[PDB]
Design a protein around this ligand. Structure first.
Ligand SMILES: NC(=O)NC(NC(N)=O)C(=O)[O-]
Ligand SMILES: NC(=O)NC(NC(N)=O)C(=O)[O-]
Ligand SMILES: [Mn+2]
Ligand SMILES: [Mn+2]
Lengths: 411, 411
């Protein structure tokens, strides 16, 4: 069975990874890009060929469905996001969608139709890496996505959300969607992304909680001027202002210690020229913690700090909080069932939280959910070198299969 | 004379400014761009039509020639650069080329052919705004440019110098050019760019020196990784490193005080995504001073500081000094002539240095050269709001005309 999944992964992973392969390294498959569309089209086609009933929903989440014999109205769901960051790896997101499909297909062949319906899902986006919105895919599954929040947003190159979506053959809905009521449980297999499993020698992570997370886009407005003729004390330099903000804030975060993390990942000065004092800089903030209050208090302090610096420098600031998620626990009963499985199968597991966000955190408050981690070598992710031992991946798909067996082929 | 020049400027300025007009603001006419080409062609056309014999040299420097009746082998040269920064104003560079033409045209119709030959020049580039090379135009006039230095460089978008240059109709020389020997004097009219003239209430700047200037491209290499799962202590974050460098260095520059200027105008993190610790940042440094030793000492200290910071952070650093120009004085005899001219005309002038770089600084060590400044309102330059009162502009052209009258219509 490990042998089967190994083979299946070796067969399909390289194939799936070709759609959105970036010449500059790794994967770049952003929400509603042509690469995004082609991935979902091809993936759909392969699931169909395997005998699954396939569909898009109104926003382009992809489903492969195998109907239940005794409770067709109850759905056990598994999968993950297909989107990536820029120059990402080929496991983050897509592996969990691929795995759910491989698990289901194998269960189908070994044990025939399930008692209750099982679905593979490949969700539209969870990376929040193209537009200033996150979890467009999963939020729509539960009608949590307000179309007003994306009707007026663009990517870095000025393409509107609405246009890109339409280019992929989807129409922005007029109002939030009807939330699904038929889901009994959701199970997301995913690479750990950090090195907790690898450094402690363990093979499977049983996730019991996911971190809280804020993302900001901040815009500094100063004055563009000549690099040579503008005396230093007359300047309104947005890159200098940005640097004080970044330097001071990272310093503060380092004093708070783990698990506070703080990242200034994207910086865009304008006009971005060697001999021009930059009169505008737009940058992002990503900040996370296991505790909601710590995350709130720390980030609010950061907002005050930024306003203080800017005010002192006579520079305009616009602070745009576009992701604000509470930490969420996984379902206790499902976490026990998973732990019990690991004990029974004699798996070398650990119980741990996720430092990454996942569609699972959107699911959790609405339907019973849990996550299975497998290791990430060197704790490298969002980097083309992201990789995992093939037997570890297979062990993950096996563990996923057994969980889905319990949940859908048993009453 | 003033009214003629006011009208001449009001006619030709919006015309010349239409080539390279950037919809997003101001002017964007970079070396060897389509806008660059059109500008040079259109200017060449109008000059020829006004009765000047025009040529391009091997690199796209544009000349408008009026031959001299008694010493045709002696050339009095005037003009400036036609390129711009990104979203620049419409006076920097082009106004002095425009003025030279307007002045020679007017002198020609009032006093006929000059004794010596006079030429307008519109030089290819002095902004160093597109490729990592500066003064490609004026350096080639004197055979100072090594073709090897540009053969393998590219713009930010990956366009090679050689391809851009070929696309414009010019062939990269196999070796350094033969310097012109026939130039007797160079006069460059130009806006001040700073606010010295405006704030002291004067109308004409008699430039006696130009600053030294260094430009670096610095490349930091760390490791891209996941914003959430990578603990702070395990990071090699290049934006954080950059920000430490920029913050500290600007602080030191302020401690040195005027005339030291230091600018970090361009920053390019990779992959530049909100939830990715950026594993690479490329940024520029622009640093200038009136004194060669101060500039050298400060920037070398900056080089040590950056190395120290990066060694401490385990981040690789590459430092590429691509412009290293000494400060240079204008010709004593010409400055005196220009000063004496201002005295006789009772122009409210002052003697000052230029904090900006100019083709005149490349000319100076080879031919007698001087510059004339006119005010810049609010000391705004390298910014679409770059403006100078029309009478000041007229007054500068007038001054240039008189200066050229003495140099060329007199023995
Ligand atoms: N599994 C992920 O990489 N998720 C990413 N996306 C969200 N929404 O968290 C991230 O940055 O952690
Ligand atoms: N007149 C200019 O703006 N020149 C520019 N160009 C050079 N080479 O200095 C600059 O940055 O100052
Ligand atoms: Mn990710
Ligand atoms: Mn300039």
């Amino acid at each position: 069975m490990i042998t089967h999944f190994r083979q299946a992964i070796e067969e399909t992973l390289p194939w799936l990874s070709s759609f959105g392969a970036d010449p500059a390294g790794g994967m770049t498959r952003l929400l509603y890009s042509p690469e995004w569309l082609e991935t979902q089209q091809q993936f759909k086609k392969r699931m169909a060929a395997s005998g699954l009933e396939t569909r898009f929903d109104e926003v382009g989440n992809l489903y492969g469905r195998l109907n239940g014999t005794e409770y067709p109205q109850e759905v056990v769901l598994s999968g993950s996001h297909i989107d990536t960051v820029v120059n990402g790896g080929n496991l983050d997101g897509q592996f969990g969608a691929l795995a759910a499909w491989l698990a289901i297909d194998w269960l189908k062949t070994q044990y025939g139709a399930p008692l209750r319906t099982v679905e593979v899902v490949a969700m539209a986006e969870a990376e929040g890496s193209r537009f200033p919105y996150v979890f467009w895919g999963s939020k729509n599954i539960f009608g949590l996505a307000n179309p007003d929040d994306v009707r007026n947003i663009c990517d870095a190159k000025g393409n509107s959300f609405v246009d890109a979506m339409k280019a992929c053959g989807f129409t922005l809905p007029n109002a939030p969607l009807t939330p699904r009521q038929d889901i009994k449980a959701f199970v997301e297999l995913h690479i750990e992304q950090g090195c907790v499993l690898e450094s402690n020698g363990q093979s499977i992570g049983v996730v019991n909680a996911i971190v809280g997370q804020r993302r900001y886009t901040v815009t500094l407005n100063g004055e563009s001027n000549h690099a040579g003729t503008t005396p230093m004390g007359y300047r309104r330099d947005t890159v200098y202002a940005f640097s004080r903000i970044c330097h001071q804030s990272v310093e503060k975060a380092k004093r708070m210690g783990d698990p506070l993390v703080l990242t200034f990942g994207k910086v865009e000065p304008r006009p971005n020229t060697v001999n021009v004092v930059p009169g505008k800089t737009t940058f992002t903030i990503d900040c996370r913690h296991t505790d909601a209050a710590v995350l709130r208090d720390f980030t609010q302090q950061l907002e005050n700090d930024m306003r203080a610096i800017c005010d002192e420098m006579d520079i305009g600031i616009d602070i745009d909080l576009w992701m604000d998620e509470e930490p969420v626990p996984m379902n206790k009963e499902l976490v026990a069932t998973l732990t019990e499985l690991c004990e029974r199968e004699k798996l070398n597991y650990r119980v741990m939280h996720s430092g990454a966000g996942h569609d699972a955190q959107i699911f959790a408050p609405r339907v019973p959910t849990c996550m299975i981690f497998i290791p990430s070598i060197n704790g490298i992710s969002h980097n083309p070198a992201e990789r995992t031992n093939i037997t570890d991946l297979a062990e993950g798909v096996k563990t996923l299969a057994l969980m889905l067996y319990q949940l859908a082929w048993q009453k």
